[PDB]
Design an enzyme around this catalytic site. Structure first.
Site, PDB file in Angstrom:
ATOM      1  N   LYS B  32      22.450  46.102  28.239  1.00 10.32           N
ATOM      2  CA  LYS B  32      21.597  45.588  27.199  1.00 10.32           C
ATOM      3  C   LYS B  32      22.039  46.164  25.854  1.00 10.32           C
ATOM      4  O   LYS B  32      22.167  47.383  25.679  1.00 10.32           O
ATOM      5  CB  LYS B  32      20.129  45.947  27.423  1.00 10.32           C
ATOM      6  CG  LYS B  32      19.182  45.312  26.404  1.00 10.32           C
ATOM      7  CD  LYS B  32      17.706  45.561  26.697  1.00 10.32           C
ATOM      8  CE  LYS B  32      17.225  46.966  26.290  1.00 10.32           C
ATOM      9  NZ  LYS B  32      17.313  47.246  24.815  1.00 10.32           N
ATOM     10  N   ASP B  59      19.449  41.771  23.194  1.00 10.59           N
ATOM     11  CA  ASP B  59      18.013  41.990  22.990  1.00 10.59           C
ATOM     12  C   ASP B  59      17.702  42.131  21.507  1.00 10.59           C
ATOM     13  O   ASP B  59      17.374  43.224  21.016  1.00 10.59           O
ATOM     14  CB  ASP B  59      17.627  43.241  23.805  1.00 10.59           C
ATOM     15  CG  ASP B  59      16.191  43.726  23.569  1.00 10.59           C
ATOM     16  OD1 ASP B  59      15.303  42.938  23.214  1.00 10.59           O
ATOM     17  OD2 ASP B  59      15.979  44.943  23.743  1.00 10.59           O
ATOM     18  N   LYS B  61      15.423  39.902  19.995  1.00 12.33           N
ATOM     19  CA  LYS B  61      14.048  39.400  19.793  1.00 12.33           C
ATOM     20  C   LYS B  61      13.926  38.548  18.517  1.00 12.33           C
ATOM     21  O   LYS B  61      13.115  38.818  17.627  1.00 12.33           O
ATOM     22  CB  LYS B  61      13.079  40.578  19.736  1.00 12.33           C
ATOM     23  CG  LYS B  61      13.153  41.516  20.936  1.00 12.33           C
ATOM     24  CD  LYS B  61      11.930  42.426  20.994  1.00 12.33           C
ATOM     25  CE  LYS B  61      11.931  43.273  22.274  1.00 12.33           C
ATOM     26  NZ  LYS B  61      13.069  44.248  22.308  1.00 12.33           N
ATOM     27  N   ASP B  64      11.908  33.681  13.876  1.00  6.70           N
ATOM     28  CA  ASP B  64      12.082  33.042  12.584  1.00  6.70           C
ATOM     29  C   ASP B  64      11.656  31.585  12.697  1.00  6.70           C
ATOM     30  O   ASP B  64      11.172  31.147  13.735  1.00  6.70           O
ATOM     31  CB  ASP B  64      13.542  33.134  12.150  1.00  6.70           C
ATOM     32  CG  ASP B  64      13.707  33.258  10.627  1.00  6.70           C
ATOM     33  OD1 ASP B  64      13.030  32.535   9.854  1.00  6.70           O
ATOM     34  OD2 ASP B  64      14.524  34.108  10.204  1.00  6.70           O
ATOM     35  N   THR B 119       5.294  46.463  24.182  1.00  7.21           N
ATOM     36  CA  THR B 119       4.699  47.613  24.885  1.00  7.21           C
ATOM     37  C   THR B 119       3.876  48.528  23.984  1.00  7.21           C
ATOM     38  O   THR B 119       2.902  49.158  24.412  1.00  7.21           O
ATOM     39  CB  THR B 119       5.841  48.428  25.524  1.00  7.21           C
ATOM     40  OG1 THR B 119       6.505  47.606  26.490  1.00  7.21           O
ATOM     41  CG2 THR B 119       5.318  49.698  26.194  1.00  7.21           C
ATOM     42  N   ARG B 204      17.505  55.942  29.867  1.00  8.88           N
ATOM     43  CA  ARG B 204      17.844  57.343  30.037  1.00  8.88           C
ATOM     44  C   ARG B 204      18.045  57.819  31.485  1.00  8.88           C
ATOM     45  O   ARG B 204      18.883  58.677  31.730  1.00  8.88           O
ATOM     46  CB  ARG B 204      16.840  58.222  29.267  1.00  8.88           C
ATOM     47  CG  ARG B 204      16.932  57.997  27.753  1.00  8.88           C
ATOM     48  CD  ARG B 204      16.109  58.997  26.936  1.00  8.88           C
ATOM     49  NE  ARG B 204      16.745  60.316  26.844  1.00  8.88           N
ATOM     50  CZ  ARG B 204      16.522  61.348  27.666  1.00  8.88           C
ATOM     51  NH1 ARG B 204      15.667  61.259  28.688  1.00  8.88           N
ATOM     52  NH2 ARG B 204      17.169  62.489  27.464  1.00  8.88           N
TER      53      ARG B 204
END
Ligand SMILES: [Cl-]
Ligand SMILES: [Cl-]
Ligand SMILES: [Cl-]
Ligand SMILES: [Cl-]
Ligand SMILES: [Mg+2]
Lengths: 231, 224
Positions: B32, B59, B61, B64, B119, B204
């Site tokens: 990603k 990614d 997002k 517009d 999130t 991570r």
């Protein structure tokens, strides 16, 4: 009292050579340039660097909208690139906007101007109801513009109709970047239902984002000087 | 085949990112690239990942007006990415226009995925941006809007997955972040896939591992 060109020319080319051929025709002392999602996804920071090398200031119009950590790191990346202005979605919320302002603090007075996007120009009542917003669009725009101000951002993108009221509520120094205005000297620039550049600036717009009327001109340099002289 | 793990690359340094990618096999995972690495290193970085044999989830997002969002999505298809996302809060017309512009790219076109509620957004954050609906209800609204627009799936949490899968169907793809290979409060990869996630975005736990290729192999073997 340094030079502050008010016209930001939208660069929406799918070809790098055409884009640079256009920039060759204009002067950095007379305008600023906008690089959006299309040209950035196609050509990246190297294109922005080329515009900087040519002496132009750039509005990086990527409308970042993510969790605060990610949005702030993207805004930091814009500052690493040395851009004059960068935008974020106010719908990302106050914490996202505040984190993005905070991360730019170390870049000093030369840091990018950080601007909020409220409601996209393509959206009207029907589109808003579809995404769960029931309030009248003007009230929702004011909510989001106020959120931006309260998060400590430098201004918002707004229409000429919105400008005076936004300055009244949010302050004379809050920066207003306005799209959709056509040169008075262009075709359909004589129409009265839409503000001319002079009318938009008088109404409170600080910057005017203008695209095809300039980029399609035989002599974009002449069109810019005409817009400029009128302001 | 179909690697389910998408590794998040959130490096502020190109050399460090490439040293990490050198440690893993493109047959075992996908990658990603988000707003940070793309803003810093652009399409050349994504092309290097493709040269190394990896499939990429871009990614960014996008959010517009329909014409602009669709041109950005077309730019993603020109780059050859495997997946790209847009904000469902950009509306149905923006999403449909993005799907339509991908039509000529054929079966190899990027999967087009919607973002619902980030999130970071809880009830208070939503009220601030003009949304009074419970977050779970708003997620369902926006995921349904995404499917209505003809998109391929959405990013969703471990908590949201089974309900979305039940409501929207088996073929609507669910891309799920925040999973950790084995506190009990967070789902493991096997738990998330069982709950309905189609892809797992993991950061991570893999990028900070002494042996990332072993973590991946362990995750992959645990999914059967
Ligand atoms: Cl000029
Ligand atoms: Cl965050
Ligand atoms: Cl549009
Ligand atoms: Cl409320
Ligand atoms: Mg010249």
């Amino acid at each position: 009292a340094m030079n502050d060109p008010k016209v930001i020319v939208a660069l929406d080319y799918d070809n790098l050579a055409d884009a640079l051929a256009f920039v060759d025709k204009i002067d950095p002392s007379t305008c600023r340039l906008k690089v959006g999602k299309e040209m950035f996804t196609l050509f990246g920071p190297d294109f922005v660097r080329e515009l900087h090398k040519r002496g132009f200031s750039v509005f990086l119009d990527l409308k970042f909208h993510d969790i605060p950590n990610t949005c702030s790191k993207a805004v930091k990346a814009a500052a690493e690139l040395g851009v004059w202005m960068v935008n974020v979605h106010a719908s990302g919320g106050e914490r996202m906007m505040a984190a993005s302002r905070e991360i730019l603090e170390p870049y000093g007075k030369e840091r990018p101007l950080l601007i909020g996007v409220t409601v996209l120009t393509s959206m009207e009542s029907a589109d808003l109801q579809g995404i769960g917003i029931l309030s009248a669009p003007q009230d929702h725009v004011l909510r989001l513009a106020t959120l931006t101000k309260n998060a400590g951002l430098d201004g918002v993108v707004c229409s000429a109709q919105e400008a005076s009221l936004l300055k009244q509520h949010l302050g004379r120094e809050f920066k207003l970047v306005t799209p959709g205005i056509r040169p008075a000297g262009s075709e359909q620039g004589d129409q009265r239902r839409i503000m001319t550049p002079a009318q938009a600036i008088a109404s409170g717009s600080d910057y005017l984002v203008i695209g095809r009327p300039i980029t399609q001109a035989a002599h974009p340099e002449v069109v810019l000087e005409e817009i400029n002289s009128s302001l």
